[PDB]
């Protein structure tokens, strides 16, 4: 049931089929075939591509189409945070002898409680933030390509995902990941080129976006009424990075002080970020790659965000639709529709042949990303949480419970899929960053206090963590539950709660849980100094043998650099940051 749709000419059919035959080709080959050593350039480029996933294209273009240029702010916070990985959070995992921040918080506080809690928190942030967002992004791409419901589309994205996993898949990653990322950035550059051609240049985008609004502004359903021009016409400031502190969609204050709290937690504590970061031969290599990955945080603004805007100019009757009836008719959700910006742009601009390659590669990536995250949530669940409940495991038995977990989280993500669909007025970006502002800032506070206040004991961290979840859930649940609605039909939850921007609530939850940590901490017994060495910043150059806190439950450790190459790397970070800041000043 598909005819004379821009994917149904067999140039693109042959190209999509060929690529998902070549990925199973690399995979069955891989099945039968069978910390250091990565250099500045390759380990910079792995950080970049760690965050370029179809979910990013969808959301960052979509929010581009909705709000103008200031989601690009997001990305330019990222490069200052990656620098601070490369300088602050990367040395600490090197000095401590750890890899994971769970391994660090096992050495730093000691108890099985904080490992248990972060593990359960990580399960909720893969169900809410990774699995459901990836399923949703597949659904969107597929709908714009071959009109199909969300539910039918995920049935298919999970069908191809299961036959990715069982036919090699995650074994044959390094080959597939290198080639997927090369042709995503290739495809993205070609399609950007086509978008700026179609709008009539760069001058075209800027002279045409602020008038790009829809013609259909009235609803059959009364109560909605004659829809206001506040809502349907684009925002009067949408060429600027820095917005009003209080009435901005992405307030300046918030972006700076509050994305750091949340982007910080992502770069300090992700499995993939830290696992790819600690592949250098050296801290100099790590630092110089973390400089190159900044130079790759400005490409997305052109590659992802400006195409969202050109998706609004070219296709305003769909991308910028306001009326509850017309939105459902185009994107399947009353609340809005910007989410279709990047996929609609791919289907309708990229010419025959190339079109299928770009759809194939954006789809094989969600196959890989889903398969990665199912494996990762399975180990974490199978080890941390079952072992604790029942440490009597037949490894056969365990491998069942490992497989039965993946069934449960497929189902709970698919259950959650319509909340992700109309999440923040139909803005995937905002939902991702809003979930991560409700759940991250406690952990941000406990890791920035662990590592710079040695007085903070274990009682402290745990109750900081648990007192941050209750404040955070006192807004994350209440908001996904009273609905969020949108511009046309405002929400219902009150602003004693969901008034303020989610990034401002991240700032308050950061400082609040922080003080819980400090106060429970200073009312209990301190950690003795002897089992704190090369864990706190005050004791990183100590050279004194310590009697580890995890060692109580048991009964690549170099930060050297050539100072000539260290002067080189510190120069290149300061040049890159000046370049970044000038690009920010231009688009402020």
């Amino acid at each position: 049931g598909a005819q004379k749709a821009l994917i149904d000419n067999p140039a693109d059919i042959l190209v999509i089929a060929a690529y998902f035959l070549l990925v199973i080709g690399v995979g069955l080959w891989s099945m039968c075939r069978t910390g250091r050593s990565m250099v500045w350039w390759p380990v910079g480029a792995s950080l970049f591509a760690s965050n370029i996933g179809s979910g990013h294209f969808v959301g960052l273009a979509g929010t581009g189409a909705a709000s103008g240029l200031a989601v690009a702010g997001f990305e330019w916070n990222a490069l200052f945070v990656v620098l601070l990985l490369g300088w602050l959070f990367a040395p600490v995992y090197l000095t401590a002898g750890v890899i994971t921040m769970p391994q660090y918080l096992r050495k730093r506080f000691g108890g099985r409680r904080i490992r248990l809690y972060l593990s359960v928190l990580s399960l909720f942030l893969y169900i809410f933030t990774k699995i459901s967002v990836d399923m949703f992004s597949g659904a969107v791409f597929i709908q714009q390509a071959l009109g199909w419901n969300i539910y039918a589309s995920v049935i298919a994205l999970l069908g191809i995902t299961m036959i990715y996993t069982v036919t090699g898949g995650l074994a044959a990653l390094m080959y597939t990941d290198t080639v997927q990322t090369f042709v995503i950035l290739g495809g993205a550059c070609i399609l950007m080129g086509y978008a700026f051609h179609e709008v009539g240049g760069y001058s075209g985008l800027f002279d045409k976006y602020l008038g790009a609004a829809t013609s259909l502004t009235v609803s059959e359903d009364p109560a909605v009424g004659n829809i206001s021009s506040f809502c349907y016409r684009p925002r009067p400031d949408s060429y600027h990075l820095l917005r009003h502190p209080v009435t901005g969609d992405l307030p300046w204050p918030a972006l700076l002080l509050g994305l750091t709290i949340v982007s910080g937690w992502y770069w300090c504590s992700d499995q993939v970020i830290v696992q790819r970061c600690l592949a250098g031969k050296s801290l100099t290599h790590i630092k110089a790659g973390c400089i190159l990955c900044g130079y790759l945080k400005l490409t997305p603004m052109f590659l992802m965000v400006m195409p969202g805007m050109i998706s609004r100019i070219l296709y305003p009757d769909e991308v910028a639709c306001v009326v509850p009836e017309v939105c459902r008719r185009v994107c399947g959700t009353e609340v809005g529709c910007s989410n279709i910006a990047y996929p609609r742009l791919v289907v309708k601009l990229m010419p025959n042949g190339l079109r299928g390659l770009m759809l194939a590669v954006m789809l094989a990536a969600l196959m890989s990303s889903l398969a990665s995250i199912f494996n990762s949530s399975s180990t974490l669940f199978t080890m941390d949480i079952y072992t604790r409940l029942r440490p009597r495991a037949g490894d056969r038995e365990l491998l069942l419970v490992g497989r039965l977990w993946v069934v449960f989280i497929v189902v709970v993500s698919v259950a959650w899929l319509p909340v992700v669909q109309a999440a923040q007025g139909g803005q995937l970006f905002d939902y991702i960053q809003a979930v991560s502002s409700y759940l991250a800032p406690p952990v941000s506070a406990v890791f920035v206090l662990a590592l710079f206040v040695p007085r903070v004991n274990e009682q402290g961290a745990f109750w900081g963590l648990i007192g941050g979840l209750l404040m955070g859930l006192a807004r994350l649940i209440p908001e996904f539950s009273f609905g969020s609605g949108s511009c046309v039909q405002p929400s219902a939850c009150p602003a004693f709660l969901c008034g303020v921007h989610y990034l401002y609530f991240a700032i308050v939850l950061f400082f609040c849980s922080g003080l819980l940590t400090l106060t429970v901490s200073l009312c209990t017994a301190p950690i003795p100094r002897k089992h704190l060495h090369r864990l706190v910043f005050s004791l990183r150059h100590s050279k004194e043998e310590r009697e580890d806190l995890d060692a109580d439950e048991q009964q690549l450790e170099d930060i050297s650099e050539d100072p000539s190459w260290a002067r080189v790397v510190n120069l290149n970070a300061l040049l890159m940051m000046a370049v970044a800041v000038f690009l920010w000043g231009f688009y402020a």
Binding site: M577, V581, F582, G585, Y587, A588
Partner: peptide, 29 residues
């Protein structure tokens, strides 16, 4: 103009690094 706005931003940032280097030299020997 936007390029005036860019040069203002980098000028402020270099001043910010000068405050940081003065802190490291003077208050963090």
């Amino acid at each position: 103009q936007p390029w005036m706005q860019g040069l203002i931003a980098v000028a402020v940032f270099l001043v910010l690094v000068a405050i940081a280097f003065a802190v490291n030299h003077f208050w963090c020997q």
